[PDB]
């Protein structure tokens, strides 16, 4: 009859989700790139104007990957020759184009293979990292001043992170922090000398007759971790004749007694910077607030201006300690910390004093602080309807904490329940981006009266296009396990019948502080499986999941692969007990941590699941990196936690794999979860005598994301699933 | 006349011997001797200026390589490095230089164990190139100052007037002795 | 019905053939191992005595792997702590036990991690290689003498071969050749300084946090090859106060003009050695016969005594030039060389004369020379019945070449057509080992009258066991292609009916000079398939195969991947035309070179084959070692043969794989055919969109010979074949 969401539709991306990506250049203007040229929009009443034209982009011979606009609007930074390295890191060539003279700046150019470039928040100061060294350009045409001279490849990193910091700590390649008005440039230096390297073979293009070995400094669980130093340089004193001087800011005395991390850098004022330090045993953190001393030229860090965050029941933060949001004068700040009951909420701090006053409370969590103003604070929370999966924007008076108003709860209640926000420079205009149960909707608002200005994008065309096709429906509900609610989502096939019985596939991540059950509209592999193959795809949020308090998230502390596995198995049992699930046909699949949970579920010997797919799975926690593993498990030493490091392993349970059908997939050039982990799973399975299926992917990273590789892997897993359920 | 030049500097190898053509014979007292044998005029018979000519060829030469230089020998030395000529009366010396002399030792002793020419349908015919009693070696140009390590193989494309094939030479290395042993031939005319 | 040959019968090895492995220690005596004892036997009368007892082995704390006998019988050499490295190389610990004194020798023992140990041909001299250096013990209790001082790991090899030599040139790890009575020790020195290294990862046991990288000097096609030198040392002049003197023997100038190999070392007399050198273009070879001069203590090779062996239509030899067999005086020898027609026959040589005379003629080939006594020469050939896959023992009279007598043609005609022999020390008694169409049979004969003494092994127990098993049958016949007979074999299911149609699996190797159609009894995977699954397993000998003449064998020259593939396809077409073969269910499988041919056949787009399995296949000929590849293809340079090197890849044919089902298997720790080849095949197949099945085997070499991995791979391949043929 009618068309359905097919695999080609997912792989070829026939149905496109339109987005409205804008960059707020000013308090009431933003840049939008439509029809391959940048336009300026007035936030009040439309009033669009052309900023750059397509012909200008046609001028230079090479293709432009990305552009960056100087805050004064006089220069643009054109990025080309893009070459990706890791999830957040790359190298590229950059060209500077004058917007007033309308010409290229050909003298004293930024060198090729530049690792990172950034503008100052005001003016047109330019700082970039080249060969692990920092250079600062006061003007785009004048020569650059070299800041650091100790940059060494794979040894010393200046202004950029190493692998582990970029992956787990900062979630970014940049370790540069400009001052609020561009006077000081703070940077971190990472030393990876004694950090051991992971080596894997890179079978490059077919013309290469000898494979290359990629050596990456990678601290595994319990190994030497990279070491860090923090420096602040003064860019107004830079002179050509002399070398620049960098003033080092040391970690607190309570933090130098062992291994530590630098987890956050924030500028409080033009002469005040806050640093957060985290111990290797990541249940202790200290915030250091330091003030510039004009006579000395040095930065003084007072002991009385130190704030300590502790966690008796687990780790500090969700993945890291949260960032502070200082006031205009810089004498106080707002931070999201866990309350006495375990729910993260905004607490009001004063830099001099230890005690903090909580301004929000309840059985819900604050997701983040969005904007701070003299009169109001804006934040995202899941308070509405008591659903942990939803997100909404709120505002709270700073003179009266009782008056709290929801700015997005009733705008379109049915279609939008998952909100995100972008605020202008002075926070008088914001864009609300919903991606709730309905199609994504983008709107513009003004903060003065919280009135709706216009609709930037409503995804009308997809709605027109999706009327012909047969779409599945998402149901979000909860179950009671032990006097507590755990939320699940199910992708029900079209014309779902409660009397009929369907196969069930469990989509699993089940990592610490994760949410696989939310109100987000997605067009993915589950849409195909529900729309075309009539398979129910279900996800569960059990113990160790986030955004529902610390009693649930910290339940898997030092015990990884124990409670989440049993929670997934019990969820599958409850789903089969619900009534419309075929007990003979139940499957489970996951990626990364989800692959680990899938493997442990299959090796548990419960008999609930018929088959499973693990994609790039973690097999042993001693093979994974130190920061992530030691956040949740501790150190792999006989003193504290070696016993559970040995117990929680997929290999140990290889004898229970006889009762299931297993698909094991891994990319050979994976740097996050190395191929060694699957290679050990397969070796254990072969040693026991288990029949299973495997597939490697040459030169493929953690996310097996090419065109051909992505299409191939999803076609292969669709074939496996159709063979499992005996589908036509 | 003056025999200072032979004494100064680094002595040459056997295959790259140096000849001085000019009496005295006091210099034999300078270093210890071992073999004064002759085939023509007997040793200790010097005519001073009555000799029409006096030629000497000298070269660093180990004493272990002694049986390979004789009136009649079948070895690498005679075949490819140095064969004595008996048209004129000559006298071998094979003396050993002492210490504290103006003689810088060579790094090692060297000689050529093979030196032939290759030319055929598919480079098949091998022709060893035996040297004349009075001529130098064709394979001299390969490392005239000696070889580094043992069993080096040298090759070059011979041009016309030399045969037009491929010249292959193999050299041998013997480590230097504590004191420098050298070799002389004195032909009187 | 009755029992059949099952998969567990093959994997657990339920039915086992028995062997009679003996070591002739004398003209009339040999040693045999039974009941964990060492029994010496009298060949003339058959009585035995206990050479070594049970209790002698039990006094050692270690488990003895192998034993060695001094030619005088005074010392045993017991090998333990076995550690395998490559196909032929290993390290072990050795201890010497005196048989007269009945005690272990504890003074100056052979060091641990000894690479190779060998006795002298007479007496009890020992030469062993430790740390890439050669040591010689004149007596087992006296200290050893260091022969070489230049040994270095992965750089310089003394007395032992490097990977490419051990794999392709010598098929052995030793590079030591004792003099006929042990006065001289000849050895080769290899130099791998500029040879590039192949790097792959070795995961090891699960307790290892970081995988190891294995660096093996491996010269690929066109890369820098190792350098070889040859030395002879006099072991009678060894002293404890002077270093041993080794006299170098240089190659002929016809090889010194470029790259070359050392192919064979054979002693003619006590003071004569023969050396065979091959050019990198392996169609030119020279044998050098060198003599020892006692005046100089030097070895001299005359130019007149050099023997040229060249090939115009291909390469020299079957794989390497054949070994000479000198007479007692050492002034003449017999060699197997190709005649004008193209058939390998024994030619009689004089050391100093260039012309040699052929003593055998025919449209058949001599396989090898087995013994050379006065007035008689013993050899193995496939002359009998015109069957290229049979082997029979013949003797020829040196006084009259017209008197040729087959010593095994009419011994047991139905049961025995494939013969191997082992002669005594003076060729007075020979053991005839048969492995023909029937069960293997071992008999002892005396050469004075060619009379049979006794039957050493009858395999009567296996015959009794196999009467209750439905066993498969083998048919050996030929087909005519362009007026040329090409032979094939067929493992037929029990109760074979020509009227019925059967699925057909084509087992292929098709390498140069290969024979897959012979009269050899086997119990392998094909027995199970034919006995249990009723699948016809066929092998075909096409163009490029051996033992049929140079016209058939050299058709593959410089055209690898062209004629063998077409011959396999045409053979499949003929098989389907025979009338008992299901045309829809035809499959092809192979290992190593067979995997390459299978992949080429599947990418040919012929449509004959439904599916295929490739195990450790060659993908690109530039990824393989230089010796093997350049024997058949040449250098990969634009002047010589790069275009075929580019046209003969499995990758180029990735588009045609959409019409077949593919199973691709490799072991990650493979050092012969690296994992890079299968990785490149899989990468090409993903790019074009082809769905296939893959399986990697962790830590598994080319053989995949570990018991668990062997069982796993054959179970997986059986599952795949059953699925392809829709077998219930
Ligand atoms: C295993 O193989 C490797 C690689 O093939 C071997 O290593 C090579 O060893 C050779 C030595 O034969 C070496 O070549 C020398 O390198 C020196 C440093 O680069 C050069 O200086 C030297 O040239 C001089 O010697 C030549 C004679 O060998 C002369 O012909 C030449 O003109 C140069 O002359 C200098 O020296 C003389 C004194 O001898 C002096 O009077 C002159 O004035 C002048 O100064 C050689 O080219 C290679 O560089 C090595 N290659 C490497 C290391 O990669 C290794 O030896 C092999 N191992 C074994 C055990 O055989
Ligand atoms: C990076 O770290 C290494 C080691 O952690 C530092 O090297 C040490 O330098 C000190 C000098 O102060 C020596 O005493 C140590 O012996 C060195 N250790 C090692 C292992 O080399 C190195 O100086 C650091 N680099 C920077 C730029 O800080
Ligand atoms: C700035 O510092 C760098 C490195 O500390 C100086 O560069 C060194 O200069 C010395 C003396 O000229 C050289 O011996 C080194 O080789 C240089 N090192 C490098 C990495 O370049 C540089 O001279 C300093 N500049 C000034 C103006 O003092
Ligand atoms: C950016 O901020 C810095 C820090 O407040 C300013 O630098 C100070 O400026 C005042 C007034 O000009 C001087 O008295 C101080 O000596 C300066 N201190 C330092 C460390 O430079 C700077 O002027 C600001 N720039 C702009 C453009 O506002
Ligand atoms: C952070 O975690 C560590 C490890 O769990 C805690 O150290 C433990 O402290 C208790 C109480 O003093 C001891 O009984 C344990 O023996 C300690 N374990 C180890 C491995 O040393 C530490 O107390 C925690 N810190 C905070 C602030 O909660
Ligand atoms: C035999 O040769 C070896 C190496 O060629 C000699 O060992 C060397 O001896 C010298 C002086 O005693 C040392 O400086 C070297 O370090 C030694 N090398 C090695 C590798 O050991 C040994 O002395 C020689 N033996 C005799 C008797 O001459
Ligand atoms: C092993 O063979 C060698 C080589 O023929 C024999 O050595 C020769 O023996 C004869 C007689 O004793 C001497 O005249 C030669 O000078 C020896 N040559 C060398 C190179 O040593 C040796 O005698 C044989 N050993 C046996 C038969 O036990
Ligand atoms: C070994 O094979 C090479 C390569 O096929 C032969 O070299 C060829 O020789 C013929 C005739 O002289 C020339 O026409 C070709 O151009 C040569 N090819 C190359 C690549 O040089 C060589 O002759 C053969 N050696 C024999 C038969 O002894
Ligand atoms: C649009 O914005 C420009 C400034 O960018 C302003 O000059 C103009 O008046 C605006 N148009 C209106 C208000 O209609
Ligand atoms: C500018 O060029 C692009 C081509 O990349 C085109 O799509 C766009 O329509 C052009 N702009 C205008 C205003 O025509
Ligand atoms: C970057 O590389 C290109 C191409 O080699 C070259 O033309 C250009 O000058 C380089 N840029 C710099 C800053 O050197
Ligand atoms: C690991 O499992 C063993 C049983 O095999 C148990 O004795 C031990 O207590 C466990 N350790 C843990 C759960 O930390
Ligand atoms: C030697 O031991 C084996 C088993 O250990 C036994 O079968 C055999 O009979 C023993 N030998 C003798 C002569 O008893
Ligand atoms: C076999 O018996 C004969 C006697 O006929 C004897 O000479 C021979 O040594 C015996 N063989 C063994 C191995 O005992
Ligand atoms: C070999 O190793 C063992 C164990 O360390 C040791 O006892 C023995 O002495 C070693 N052998 C030699 C010859 O050193
Ligand atoms: C092999 O491919 C090359 C590349 O185009 C071509 O030049 C050559 O003719 C091809 N060879 C054959 C036999 O088709």
Author numbering:
A (entry chain C), C (entry chain A): 39 to 766
B (entry chain B): 391 to 412, 418 to 584
Task: Recite the paper's sentences.
Merbecoviruses from bats, pangolins, and hedgehogs pose significant zoonotic threats, with a limited understanding of receptor binding by their spike (S) proteins. Spike (S) protein is the major viral surface glycoprotein of MERS-CoV and forms homotrimers. For the MERS-CoV S-trimer, NTD is known to mediate cell adsorption by binding sialic acid, while RBD is known to bind the human dipeptidyl peptidase 4 (hDPP4) as the entry receptor.
Here, we report the cryo–electron microscopy (cryo-EM) structures of the GD-BatCoV and SE-PangolinCoV RBDs bound to hDPP4. The GD-BatCoV and SE-PangolinCoV RBDs exhibit weak and strong affinities for hDPP4, respectively. The SE-PangolinCoV-RBD:hDPP4 complex has a total BSA of 1866.9 Å2, with 861.3 Å2 on the RBD and 1005.6 Å2 on the hDPP4. The BSAs in the SE-PangolinCoV-RBD:hDPP4 complex are comparable to those in the MERS-CoV-RBD:hDPP4 complex but larger than those in the HKU4-BatCoV-RBD:hDPP4 and GD-BatCoV-RBD:hDPP4 complexes. In addition, in region 1, E521PG of β7 in SE-PangolinCoV-RBD engages in two hydrogen bonds with Ala291DPP4 and Gln344DPP4. Furthermore, residue R550PG in the SE-PangolinCoV-RBD forms a hydrogen bond with the main chain oxygen of hDPP4 residue Leu294DPP4, and the corresponding residue R542MERS in the MERS-CoV-RBD also forms a hydrogen bond with Leu294DPP4. However, G541PG, S543PG, and E547PG of SE-PangolinCoV-RBD establish multiple hydrogen bonds with multiple sugars within the Asn229DPP4 glycan (region 4). Arg336DPP4 does not interact with the RBM residues of SE-PangolinCoV-RBD or HKU4-BatCoV-RBD. Further, when the F507IPG + Q508SPG + H517NPG + N518QPG + S519DPG mutant is combined with Y540GPG, the F507IPG + Q508SPG + H517NPG + N518QPG + S519DPG + Y540GPG sextuple mutant shows a 62-fold reduction in hDPP4 binding, decreasing to 585.7 nM compared to 9.4 nM for the WT SE-PangolinCoV-RBD. These results indicate that multiple hDPP4 contact sites contribute to high-affinity binding of SE-PangolinCoV-RBD to hDPP4.
